[PDB]
Amino acid sequence: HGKPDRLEKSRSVSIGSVLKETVVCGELVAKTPFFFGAIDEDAKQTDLQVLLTPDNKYRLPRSAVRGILRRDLQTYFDSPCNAELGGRPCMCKTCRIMRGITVMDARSEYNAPPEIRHRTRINPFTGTVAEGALFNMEVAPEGIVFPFQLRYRGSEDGLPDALKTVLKWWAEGQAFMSGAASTGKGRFRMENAKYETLDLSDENQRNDYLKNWGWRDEKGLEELKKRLNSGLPEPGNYRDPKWHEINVSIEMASPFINGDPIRAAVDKRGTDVVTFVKYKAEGEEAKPVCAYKAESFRGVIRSAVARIHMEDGVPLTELTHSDCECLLCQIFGSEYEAGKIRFEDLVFESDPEPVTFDHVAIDRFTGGAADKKKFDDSPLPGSPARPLMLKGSFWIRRDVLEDEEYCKALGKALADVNNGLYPLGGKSAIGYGQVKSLGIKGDDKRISRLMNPAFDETDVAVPEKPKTDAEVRIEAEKVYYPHYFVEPHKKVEREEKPCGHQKFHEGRLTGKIRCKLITKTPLIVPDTSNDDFFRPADKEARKEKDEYHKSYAFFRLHKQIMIPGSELRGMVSSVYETVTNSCFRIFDETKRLSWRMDADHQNVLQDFLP
Amino acid sequence: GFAKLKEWFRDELDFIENLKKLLWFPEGDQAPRVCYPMLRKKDDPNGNSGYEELKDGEFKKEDRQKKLTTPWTPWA
Amino acid sequence: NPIRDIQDRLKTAKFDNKDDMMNLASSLYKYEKQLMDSSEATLCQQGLSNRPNSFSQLSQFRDSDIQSKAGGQTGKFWQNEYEACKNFQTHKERRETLEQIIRFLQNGAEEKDADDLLLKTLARAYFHRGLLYRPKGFSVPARKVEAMKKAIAYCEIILDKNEEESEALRIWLYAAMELRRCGEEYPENFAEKLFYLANDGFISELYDIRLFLEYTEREEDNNFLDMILQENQDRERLFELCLYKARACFHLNQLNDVRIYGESAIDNAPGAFADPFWDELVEFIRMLRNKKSELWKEIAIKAWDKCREKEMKVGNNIYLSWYWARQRELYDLAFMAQDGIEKKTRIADSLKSRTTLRIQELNELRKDAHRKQNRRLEDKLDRIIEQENEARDGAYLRRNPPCFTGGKREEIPFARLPQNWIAVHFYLNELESHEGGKGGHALIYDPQKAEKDQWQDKSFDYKELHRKFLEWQENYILNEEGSADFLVTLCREIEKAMPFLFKSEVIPEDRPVLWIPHGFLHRLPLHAEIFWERHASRYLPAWHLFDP
RNA sequence: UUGAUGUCACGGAACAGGAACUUGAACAACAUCGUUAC
């Protein structure tokens, strides 16, 4: 808490007879969902709350603005203060400015409930989520305005140089106020600035200032807002900000999904898994937009870095990162030191509506459906004709770009993401986010000089196909059957420790194969979104429920003939697990059978006593 | 890859012969008529001894899991 | 590997003894704890062999336990976990294991069915975590204080039902004795619990000798004073035992036996200044001084003589230090007790310009040396870092001090000055200026006068000069025309506070004077009555920087 | 519910670390129901 000193000294300082009070008014708008920690008790469902007003209005506290001003002033001068909460006042350059600044609060009148996000933690050995590692966090929307007033009472001719430079940084759009800045929380922008310098050194202006208690109340502020001059003062010594912004663009060809189970449980559509949407405030009402989260992109890039670098034998994914100095623990921060890269959300450059895709699970024995289960999903549609762009930006700081090894690590990771590995999104086993083209601009070719494609040149044609030998004796006038089960062997070669996705191993292979399919008999792959495709015109549409004659069509994505990846995965999986003599990978182990009994058999009906 | 299949199963690759017999495609001038039987014999104009004349005959209850494992066996 | 053990314990489970059931519960807990974090043993994807028998046994174990939830399972498992955590290597793994224990068993201690073993081991985990907190602000961190307070709260939860425990009472007293030396106040019930412990006796450790000595000095009893004198030698920490024996033999008036134990205790002091031994040494000296004894002079001088050799040489001209926050006090106590003037100015020169740094800048320097691919700065800074961070658990479990010597800095002799120069050394005492003493001293050396009186010592007050200097400094950076007469009143204060500089027998009339200042006298506005027109004045920060 | 001759608390950013991920061909042939007669 405290400890004031009570045996210090007594002094007497004369501070001249000049006094000037400068007012800077305006507003500041949110460009990203912000966060202000107010984690209170008696509510343990969500473990990261936000600060709200007793009538549920988002407020921006005074202490946060004051702390951010102190941090930016200690950034301008390249010397941090070493005060220790006691004794006589500090006489350095930063506190001597902070001793004459007055700010106010804000309310924003929006009063809509905040939105809850979820975060997990992925096991880098099996690829799935870890055990019991799941936590939520409620965030505030985007586009919320706050009024802004700042008074400086000093002895100089207007504001100092440091305050003019810091206000220029805040007008550029680099006012990183609060929150979890590592995942791209509140980044505000100061708009409509106005400034006015009073003169308390004379006698008439001092009396006119004392006559109205300053201009602190609301009527005094509405009277003062008619004597303000537009535009901020120009600084004398513009130093520089220390956060660079570099833009990213990603797009190739495939559908996209980013899971959200609670929205799937509430949504009107009713599908099993849907994508992620976010709201933005339009003054009073909110509007939804589909996006790619910031936590997911941060995790993907962190995993692409952590799987390459050796760190004396044991790779960076097998460490614990608690109290260590690693390469991943320096760029991406730890729980002892803050990070250095701030990611952001990614929007889709259009209004792509989601489609619906159905799937079923085919039994191995008696190949039919599973226990009558159809499961569907609602991804965003992307095709080789409509590539579904993704535009975004992320921030790094100055001393990371000046180094040589950090840019090397980031270039290696982004070159591995650009080539096709590390697919973004959800169900990548059936081709979601399949390929990429990652373009990064705004760093003066410091990182994007390792993301150049290099390839070899063998010119060797794939070795021919062999001629078969298994032949059958087929005659005429003898009608056959279409089923013919295949009796398997009795020994299955199991193993309890599979490889693990922790790194790229030594004697293993990684890459991709390009194929070429050709049909020899008519092919049917249906498009089950609507049933009355071949229905004639000029009649009734359909009643609420009848049993008509269903009529499907062929599968199309953007008026373009395609075959999904699930079909090919299923057929190649069936042949592959028949060859190696594997288990019945999908089966219905329950559901006892039942048979009718015959009347001729009088030996079984001789002991069914009444 | 083939050598690995020689390490587990030594010389009992007799589920690969049937798999190669079931993926066979009619090369040419061969029209193997396949279809499913009818229920009775009085409801198909060909007279092919439907499902109720096979349960007491070739496809008996004891010889049924032998004529359903050989790859191309003639039903009728 | 952790799934075959469950089946090995499930094979011979007898469901009647309290050893096989405990082993089964331990195996289940270890498998679950292996799953909670993501280790390399998560790739094992097998199961149990005999399904129906194992299902019957596991359902009978989860069903024949709910009537016996007496806390016998989790308490013993976490007890053995902490017991394995105590005997570890370097502090990193000890810290991580302690925070994992604290995180896992903090929930099960908030109900009425709270075991004594569970609360005892939770309080011990809090107390042992409270010792491993690296400071970074020239002051003690608040998390250490609140770890001590939480340990006290849980040991009070236990001792509210019983009266004597002889295990939780010792944790309570350890936490109080740790709160005392962190600048805090004793808890309100210290005397009663100290009297409950003193009425049992039987010390068997090293902490309990300190608790008993505190009790006998609190109530003036001579019961345990002879029992703590027959302890065995050749233990793991000899110096602390010799210090305790000296403090004991002091209370029964055994002189010429306190000095020998003190001298044998000084010689084997640990190399780290964070060890909980130097603080007790300064407390012993402070207690010897204000009892109007005369024994404290020898101990203070010997402690300074063996404390100076703890520096670190990293190059050919510079040195490093440690900052243990009581060095000023020990140096002032060694200055107040030394009578020879040349020895007093040899004392005053060891407090001059040094490199007393803290942890964060040493970390910066280590990363700087690893930036320039150096190798003589990753084995000399490494010793400092991994030595002063390992001596935090010094009296709980610790072993011999793992360090080495510090070398010997060569001393420049006072006979290197020319015959015309006059040397002046300044020192600002703080211990005797906190009382009504006459502040600081000046030491004048004339190297061409008689040998029997070659040194003069003068004393003066320095509070009002400090106030005048502060007023001028505060008026200098907020004005430049209203800071004109503050300079002249500061110069008059200089001429008034130390009036012996304007004499004739000391500082003869026209000889060049060499000033060596200390403290806030380095920043005096002595630019141009004053001696900057008659005597040849020149500065020097310390006397070991005198080349010609 | 304060006490007077002495309050820099506008002297202090609730901040810092965690990929809603993994598994699934929109596919398909044999019956259903019980009693009659000596």
From TrEMBL, chain B:
* Superkingdom, taxonomy of origin: Bacteria
The coiled-coil segments of this chain are: none
Ranges of compositional bias, category Basic and acidic residues: 52-66
Task: Give positions of region: Disordered.
Answer: 38-76
**Under which name does UniProt file this protein?**
CRISPR-associated RAMP family protein
In the complete protein, the residues contained here run 1526 to 1601 of 1601
From TrEMBL, chain C:
> Which keywords does the record carry?
Coiled coil
Which residues lie in coiled coils? 367-394
Record-given protein name: CHAT domain-containing protein
Give the organism the record lists: Desulfonema ishimotonii
Task: Say which residues of the entire protein are included here.
Answer: 3 to 560 of 751
